[PDB]
Design a protein around this motif. Structure first.
Motif, PDB file in Angstrom:
ATOM      1  N   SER A   1      14.146   7.755  61.696  1.00  0.00           N
ATOM      2  CA  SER A   1      13.732   9.009  61.078  1.00  0.00           C
ATOM      3  C   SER A   1      14.289   9.125  59.665  1.00  0.00           C
ATOM      4  O   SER A   1      13.721   9.811  58.816  1.00  0.00           O
ATOM      5  CB  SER A   1      14.185  10.201  61.923  1.00  0.00           C
ATOM      6  N   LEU A   2      15.404   8.445  59.419  1.00  0.00           N
ATOM      7  CA  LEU A   2      16.013   8.422  58.097  1.00  0.00           C
ATOM      8  C   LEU A   2      16.695   7.086  57.818  1.00  0.00           C
ATOM      9  O   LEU A   2      17.321   6.497  58.700  1.00  0.00           O
ATOM     10  CB  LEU A   2      17.007   9.581  57.950  1.00  0.00           C
ATOM     11  N   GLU A   3      16.548   6.600  56.590  1.00  0.00           N
ATOM     12  CA  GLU A   3      17.247   5.400  56.152  1.00  0.00           C
ATOM     13  C   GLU A   3      18.304   5.751  55.112  1.00  0.00           C
ATOM     14  O   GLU A   3      19.103   4.904  54.713  1.00  0.00           O
ATOM     15  CB  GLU A   3      16.259   4.380  55.579  1.00  0.00           C
ATOM     16  N   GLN A   4      18.295   7.007  54.674  1.00  0.00           N
ATOM     17  CA  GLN A   4      19.188   7.466  53.613  1.00  0.00           C
ATOM     18  C   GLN A   4      20.656   7.443  54.029  1.00  0.00           C
ATOM     19  O   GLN A   4      21.541   7.242  53.196  1.00  0.00           O
ATOM     20  CB  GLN A   4      18.799   8.879  53.166  1.00  0.00           C
ATOM     21  N   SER A   5      20.911   7.654  55.315  1.00  0.00           N
ATOM     22  CA  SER A   5      22.274   7.621  55.832  1.00  0.00           C
ATOM     23  C   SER A   5      22.818   6.197  55.837  1.00  0.00           C
ATOM     24  O   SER A   5      22.075   5.240  56.046  1.00  0.00           O
ATOM     25  CB  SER A   5      22.331   8.212  57.243  1.00  0.00           C
TER      26      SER A   5
END
Length: 1597
Positions: A1512-1516
């Motif tokens: 859902s996120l790759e930013q983390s």
């Protein structure tokens, strides 16, 4: 004359410029007004070069007399143009003063070159060699002759290199040879381009046949546009075309094109061998029966010779309409309700075999095969025709791969009939969306508007969510539902259909939004609608698509037209889809119904209606183009034919009747309020489609025309030949089996009309007219093609053969009601529908729309146009290109993204589909079919095929379905026992009036309502509401359900039953089931009793037990059966092992054990679908893999599946031959080539290879396919075995093949070689000492080997089997076969059980079932005089979580935040995202490790594989990224995302601990039990672990 118009106008020199008039540069003076021709322009307008002085050349006035001209200007020369004052205009105007213009001529360099770079078309030396020239007095040229041996290459090199002018090269020249060279003198007119023709008749080498290449020398300052050119020059030629195994040569002299007799034609192959030869007839024809591998033809006569390369591609016929079906032989129609499907769905198919003419044929079997996208077969069946109608019906597996599946059919002609059908799964929606519009139609001036409301189902607004959509404008012809069949609005109106704008907006915090657009049709005289295909995108980008129509009425009431005449289903190749359109016989009156109804449907009074009958017309004309080439353009024109003034009264339907001539027509009516409505209708069956050349002349070739649209054997055809130029040739009706007409010489001048008498014997639709002509022009003036060909399809299918099917269904109907379909077959003149069969069916429109599925047409299926049966070949000039046929488009393919997203977690989507059994129409042709529609809301497309013997028909009709009230519960896919959940029952009121609902909620099964049922529920129209329904799951495994019965509704004029909905969901206990397994032999007088502490943990409701008693040691087959049946995971070995009990057991034998189960037919069906499940796993090499077809081959498992398939074949179950053959080839490879095998996890490779070779030797020996020498060679390496089982299988394999001595030695050795007790030593055979002893026991009893050892082996196996707490499916299977071996072993026994007063007794082992009450106080005494063996196997779900524990394996779970910080399970908000972090360790390598992590309810899996890095996120990063990197390193064998659990097969390493990670999302609020994480070896059960977990999980709203 012109002076009058120009009078009063001043003379003016508007321009002075050079232009390239003709091929010449030319000075031009553009005056404002026409000049006087009589004046001497040389006197008044001087032109003097600055150096060379006065310029020669008289002036030339333009025909418009406004443009003076001076041709042949010298390049790059300065010029002084002095225009005199005295120049006179036609109106006697004159310049006020002299003018002195100056101009510099363009620097035009002299040019020379060939007119073209070359062409493959043969020419003649007399024609000469064309050459464009300009200010060039000479051109050196070098002729060349290409080497024939290099000819195929050179021309090929000529093909991709000809794009540029200087394509000549030394590499090309080396393949040719010089023949002549020299300078050609030229005398072009000065400063004027000319097409000079270089003489070729005095050049001796050119007299010889061959291809030739001219190359100009580029010496001097001359420009060279086309330095090189190519031209063929040959004499004798041949033309032919083949029909599969047949071909028809046509020899002719090139000098005139006349046919030649006596030419010898040989059929050479690629090797040049002469397969056959034949002499031409007087007509020059040479028929020959050659099939494939045709290569060359060799014509010879009087020393003349000509070869024809059949290997060369056939002449392109894309410009011709040769497209069609390739079923010239028997025609097997194949049709179904839909081409679209989902995994786990039951595919349905129907078949109708017929002859080429569609006539009935005697019944025969047809071999159907279900191909997979990989191309591997899934299953094969011998379909049979019941009552003349074939009907396949098979169930897709849930795990079946998505893709383009197809079912080939074999009629015995060995020509498979492919039947493509889509198979794709869909992801469930997770967000509600609404797009409310206005009920009342908008005025044209009114702005279009829509209200959007989206929100999460778990109870949150869609704040910030993207909303992307599209706005379409469409005509509203069916504006009044109250009057079906009536049409509204002007069909003649233009721009009624166009895209508006691409909607894209963000929802507010409330989730509300608005979609508005300014009106662009204020002047419209017709009703319109603005569809809004919106889509509510998720954060993951998955969109919830929705549509919202908006009616737009120009006036309060509008004219409406209906066509009383029936719409026959004319076929159209333009869309490749038969469709009904209105039509009427020529010369007959056309009735029409007229109304002045409003939106409510009530008819209003009106007067002065303008009912005009416009007569449409069209005029085709061909038009050449550069970027498009030649095209079939047409001009349309409308002409009024008649007019009327209708005066409708209130509540009245008018009926106009306008007489009709022929061609396209349009009936319009105009209301006084400038409203307009019209309906097109065609007076002829020869309907015209857009971009369809119904009648036009293509450039060159022969534009063949037919006097009639269709023909019959008694009819006489009159073809109209129309070649551009005169030329001899031929014409004939070719067919797939060969030409009908033979010779037919033709000499067209400017058109010819030959008569064709069709024969009565021509019962084929594959017939095709064809023509050829050749021009013998000595001088190729204006180029013009020499050869010309004209192909055209010949219609033959009679209209009378078609059935006039007429379905009659209501326009609208309520959900959960039985739809009725009235059938009425008929035909004109005849009206005798004897024994007509009809196959009514219904499918949701939303499914069919995805692929635009067409209703099948048997009439088109049989009588429809067939593909061209011949392949043209000739040495004449190759066809240009033709740019290809025009092609339709939609929006491309679909279903690819879901594959990228991974397999969906079991969608709950409802696919509405129905197909009633075929019915026979009565004497009147009348019929009826009742389809029980379920709870569904939308359009429902009804379809119906009809057939007899030669007659056929098809029809379709839409049927809208809409519920008075909507009711959608929102519940978790599953619930753990003891869990609480807050259900949300949505209720929508789409009715125009408020409702006072009464919802009587109820519950059943393992579920229970927490709160009392809600009282009255008021609901304003257009308003949705959400009832809250707290609920709690009852303890134990099973099903639960919640019923709802809304009451009230109160619809006027229409009684209706109260709504009845139900919602069932599974109930799986949070913890794994526990079992106890006591067992002992009692001496007489002894008493056994169950320990009090052994049942302390089990819940009484879930507890159950079994008690076996016997006079001899036994085995509890019921436990092995229940365990093999209970296994969920679908890996190959588990599937086969779970399939064996279904194979060898029966309902009587099963009931005798007290086991409950499915009926024997259902059981055999389960065996069939299980066999298909096994075939799904098969590798392309014929091997098998543990989890997926793309995975590594598992040799021992391959032999295992081969064994089960063979034994299943012994039981009479059908298996495809190809799979058994490829698998036997694999086993034979195992025997002959041991070293190719790779078993990396094995510690002792030799023992593994020996086990595989031995078991394969057994499976092959049972089939009598195992060679003795391989078995002997395996016998030579008997020392390699690590267990006696392979030795025993090898011994049976040897004894079966007649090598009784070595086999006896092997069977003897097998019992003397115990398997190693060290579990750490992985053999890869998926075995154990227990499994080996059991399988060896069954192998011994089956072959009656060594009875004395069987008793000790039985006592040992019985002593060791019962005590195990856990068992692998393989061990359970071997123990099952072993128990089956001993089920009828004699042994008297007596007993005195606590649960019965009467003494127990038996001549054989008996297994009595026991409830928990009997289990708590269980006690068995041996009252007999002989020892009594007893077994006690109880099972049940523990009331509370077992203490965490581990053995070899270790596991721990860590819930985390998306940012990777630790996150407590308690106080979790709904919609929260969480990152579960499983961690696995082991003291020993565990290649077959399986990680199972059951989900607590209220948490729902995200279907994403973190190992692939999708999230859902790759930013983390940081805490999360390294975990994903660790999961990346994991040796994952398999993974799954079930609704209730996360699954992950893996090969754990002792020094490399596993790190699994997966996303999850809280949804439904409530308390929930939390399952412990688990991991276990799949075949070493003792190695297992269950970690600690929190007692509870409290989701909150």
């Amino acid at each position: 004359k012109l002076a009058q118009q120009s009078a009063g106008k001043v003379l003016t020199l508007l321009d002075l410029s050079e232009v390239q008039l003709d091929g010449a540069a030319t000075l031009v003076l553009t005056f404002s007004i026409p000049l006087d021709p009589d004046q001497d322009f040389s006197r008044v307008i001087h032109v003097v070069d600055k150096k060379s002085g006065k310029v020669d050349g008289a002036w030339e006035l333009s025909d418009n007399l406004k443009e003076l001209r001076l041709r042949h200007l010298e390049p790059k020369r300065d010029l002084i143009v002095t225009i005199g004052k005295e120049v006179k205009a036609l109106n006697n105007a004159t310049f006020s003063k002299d003018y002195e213009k100056t101009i510099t001529t363009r620097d035009i360099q002299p040019s020379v070159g060939f007119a073209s770079r070359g062409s493959l078309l043969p020419g003649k030396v007399v024609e000469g060699l064309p050459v464009m020239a300009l200010n060039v007095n000479n051109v050196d040229v070098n002729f060349f002759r290409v080497k024939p041996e290099s000819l195929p290459a050179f021309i090929s090199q000529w093909e991709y290199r000809n794009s540029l002018a200087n394509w000549q090269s030394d590499k090309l020249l080396q393949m040719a040879d010089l023949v002549y060279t020299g300078r050609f003198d030229l005398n072009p007119a000065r400063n004027t381009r000319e097409k000079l023709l270089l003489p070729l008749g005095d050049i001796k080498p050119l007299q010889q046949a061959g291809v030739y290449l001219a190359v100009m020398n580029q010496a001097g300052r001359y420009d060279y546009s086309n330095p090189a050119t190519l031209f063929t020059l040959s004499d004798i030629g041949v033309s032919a075309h083949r029909y599969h195994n047949r071909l028809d040569i046509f020899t002719q002299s090139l000098e005139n094109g006349a046919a030649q007799q006596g030419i010898e034609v040989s059929l050479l192959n690629e090797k040049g061998q002469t397969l056959t030869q034949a002499t031409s007839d007087a007509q020059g024809h040479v028929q020959l029966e050659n099939d494939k591998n045709a290569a060359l033809l060799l014509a010879r006569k009087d020393g003349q010779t000509t070869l024809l390369d059949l290997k060369l591609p056939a002449l392109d016929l894309a410009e011709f309409n040769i497209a069609g079906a390739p079923g010239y032989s028997k025609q097997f129609f194949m049709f179904g309700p839909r081409d679209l499907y989902r995994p786990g769905e039951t595919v349905i198919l129907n078949g109708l075999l017929r002859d080429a003419d569609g006539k009935a044929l005697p019944n025969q079997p047809i071999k159907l095969d279900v191909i997979k996208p990989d191309g591997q077969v899934l299953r094969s069946v011998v379909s049979q025709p019941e009552n003349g109608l074939y009907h396949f019906t098979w169930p897709l597996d849930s795990n079946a791969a998505t893709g383009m599946w197809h079912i080939r059919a074999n009629t015995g002609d060995n020509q498979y009939r492919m039947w493509d059908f889509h198979v794709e799964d869909f992801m469930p929606e997770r967000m509600a969306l609404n797009l409310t519009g206005e009920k009342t139609p908008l005025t044209p001036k009114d702005e279009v508007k829509f209200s959007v409301v989206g929100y999460y189902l778990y109870g949150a607004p869609a704040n910030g969510n993207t909303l992307q959509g599209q706005l379409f404008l469409r005509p509203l012809r069916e504006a009044v539902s109250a009057l079906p069949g009536f049409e509204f609005g002007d069909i003649a109106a233009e721009n009624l259909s166009r895209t508006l704008d691409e909607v894209q907006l963000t929802l507010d915090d409330k989730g509300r939004g608005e979609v508005s657009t300014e009106s662009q049709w204020k002047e419209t005289h017709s009703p319109l609608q603005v569809i809004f295909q919106g889509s509510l995108l998720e954060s993951g980008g998955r969109p919830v698509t929705r549509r919202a129509e908006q009616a737009i009425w120009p006036a309060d009431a509008l004219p409406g037209i209906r066509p009383q005449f029936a719409s026959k289903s004319v076929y159209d190749y333009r869309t490749d889809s038969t469709v009904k359109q209105p039509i009427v016989d020529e010369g007959s009156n056309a009735a029409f119904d007229i109304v002045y109804s409003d939106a409510q449907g009530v008819k209003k009074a009106v007067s002065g209606l303008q009912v005009r009958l416009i007569r449409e017309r069209r005029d085709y004309y061909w038009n050449w183009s550069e970027d498009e080439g030649w095209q079939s353009q047409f001009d349309q024109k409308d002409l009024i034919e008649n007019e009327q003034t209708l005066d409708l009264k209130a509540d009245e339907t008018g009926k106009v009747s306008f007489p009709v001539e022929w061609g396209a027509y349009r009936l319009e009516v105009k209301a006084p309020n400038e409203a307009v409505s019209s309906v097109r209708f065609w007076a002829g069956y020869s309907w015209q489609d857009n971009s369809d050349g119904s009648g036009a002349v293509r450039p060159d070739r022969v534009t063949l025309k037919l006097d009639k649209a269709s023909y019959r054997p008694g009819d006489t055809i009159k073809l109209h030949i129309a070649a551009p130029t005169a030329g001899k040739g031929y014409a004939m009706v070719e067919s797939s089996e060969g030409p009908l007409w033979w010779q037919e010489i033709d000499v067209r001048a400017q058109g010819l009309d030959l008569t064709i008498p069709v024969d009565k014997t021509w019962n084929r639709h594959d017939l095709y007219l064809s023509t050829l002509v050749v021009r013998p022009g000595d001088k190729s003036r204006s180029a013009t093609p020499k050869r010309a060909v004209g192909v055209l399809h010949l219609p033959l299918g009679d209209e009378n053969r078609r059935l006039d099917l007429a379905l009659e269904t209501p326009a609208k109907m309520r959900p959960n009601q039985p739809l009725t379909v009235k059938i009425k077959a008929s035909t004109k003149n005849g009206e005798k529908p004897k024994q007509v069969n009809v196959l009514v069916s219904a499918v949701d429109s939303g499914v069919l729309n995805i692929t635009d599925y067409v209703t099948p047409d048997p009439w088109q299926a049989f009588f429809g146009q067939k593909r061209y049966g011949a392949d043209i070949y000739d040495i004449y000039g190759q066809v240009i290109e033709g740019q290809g046929r025009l092609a339709a488009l939609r929006f491309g393919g679909d279903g690819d993204e879901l594959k990228r997203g991974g397999k969906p977690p079991v969608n709950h989507v409802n696919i509405v589909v129905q197909q009633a059994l075929p019915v026979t129409l009565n004497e009147q042709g009348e019929g009826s079919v009742t389809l029980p529609i379920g709870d569904f809301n939308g359009e429902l497309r009804v379809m119906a095929q009809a057939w007899t013997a030669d007659d056929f028909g098809s029809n379709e009709s839409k049927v809208i379905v809409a519920a008075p009230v909507i009711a959608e519960l929102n519940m978790p896919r599953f619930m753990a026992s003891g869990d609480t959940s807050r259900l949300t029952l949505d209720i929508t009121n789409l009715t125009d009036k408020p409702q006072k609902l009464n919802v009587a909620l109820t519950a059943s099964g393992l579920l229970e309502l927490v709160s009392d049922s809600p009282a009255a529920v008021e609901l304003a129209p257009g308003v949705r509401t959400t009832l809250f329904i707290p609920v709690r799951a009852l303890p134990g495994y099973g099903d639960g359900e919640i019923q709802a019965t809304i009451s009230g509704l109160a619809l006027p004029g229409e009684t209706v039953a109260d709504q009845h909905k139900q919602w069932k969901i599974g109930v799986r206990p949070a913890f794994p089931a526990q079992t106890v397994n006591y067992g002992t032999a009692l001496q007489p007088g002894e008493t056994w009793a169950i320990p009090a502490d052994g049942l302390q943990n089990f819940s009484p409701v879930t507890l159950e037990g079994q008690l076996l008693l016997s006079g001899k040691p036994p085995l509890n087959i019921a436990r092995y059966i229940k365990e093999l049946k209970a296994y969920p995971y679908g890996c190959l070995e588990q599937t086969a092992s779970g399939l064996f009990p279904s194979l060898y057991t029966n309902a009587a034998q099963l009931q005798a054990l007290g086991i409950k189960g499915d009926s024997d037919e259902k059981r055999r069906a389960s065996v069939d679908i299980g066999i298909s499940r096994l075939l799904q796993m098969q590798r392309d090499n014929g091997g098998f893999a543990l989890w997926d077809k793309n995975g590594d081959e598992e040799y021992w498992l391959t032999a295992y599946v081969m064994d089960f398939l063979v034994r299943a074949g012994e039981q009479g179950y059908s298996v495809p031959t190809d799979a058994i053959n490829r698998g036997n080839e694999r086993l034979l490879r195992y025997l002959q080539d041991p070293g190719m095998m790779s078993i990396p996890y094995a510690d002792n490779l030799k023992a593994s290879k020996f086990a595989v070779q031995s078991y394969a030797a057994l499976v092959l020996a049972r089939q009598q396919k195992a060679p003795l020498g391989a078995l002997r060679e395996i016998w030579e390496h008997r020392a390699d075995a690590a267990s006696g089982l392979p030795l025993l299988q090898l011994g049976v394999a040897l004894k079966t093949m007649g090598d009784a001595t070595r086999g006896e030695e092997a069977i003897a050795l097998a019992l003397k070689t115990p398997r190693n007790s060290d579990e750490r030593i992985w053999l890869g055979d998926y075995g154990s000492s227990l499994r080996d002893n059991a399988l060896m026991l069954s192998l011994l009893e089956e072959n009656k080997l060594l009875p004395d050892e069987q008793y000790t082996l039985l006592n040992t196996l019985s002593q060791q089997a019962f005590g195990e707490r856990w068992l692998s499916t393989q061990e359970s299977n071997a123990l099952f076969l072993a128990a089956r071996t001993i089920q009828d072993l004699p042994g008297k026994w007596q007993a005195q059980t606590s649960f019965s007063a009467e003494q127990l007794t038996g001549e054989k082992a008996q297994n009595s079932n026991l409830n928990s009450d009997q289990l708590v106080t269980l006690q068995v005494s041996n009252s007999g005089d002989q020892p009594l063996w007893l077994r006690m196997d109880a099972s049940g779900y523990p009331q509370s979580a077992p203490l965490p524990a581990n053995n070899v394996l270790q596991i721990e779970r860590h819930i985390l935040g998306t940012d990777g910080k630790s996150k407590s399970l308690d106080s979790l908000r709904s919609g929260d995202l969480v990152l579960v972090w499983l961690q696995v360790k082991a003291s020993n390598s565990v290649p077959d490790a399986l990680v199972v992590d059951l989900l607590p309810a209220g948490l729902e899996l995200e279907n994403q594989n973190l190992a692939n890095g999708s999230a859902s996120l790759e930013q983390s990063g940081g805490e999360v990224q390294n975990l994903l990197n660790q999961m990346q390193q994991a040796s994952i064998k398999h993974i799954e995302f079930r609704d209730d659990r996360f699954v992950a097969a893996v090969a754990v390493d002792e020094y490399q601990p596993v790190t699994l990670v997966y996303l999850a999302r809280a949804v439904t609020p409530g308390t929930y039990q939390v399952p412990q994480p688990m991991v276990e070896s799949m075949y070493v059960p003792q190695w297992r672990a269950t970690g600690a977990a929190e007692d509870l999980l409290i989701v909150r709203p």
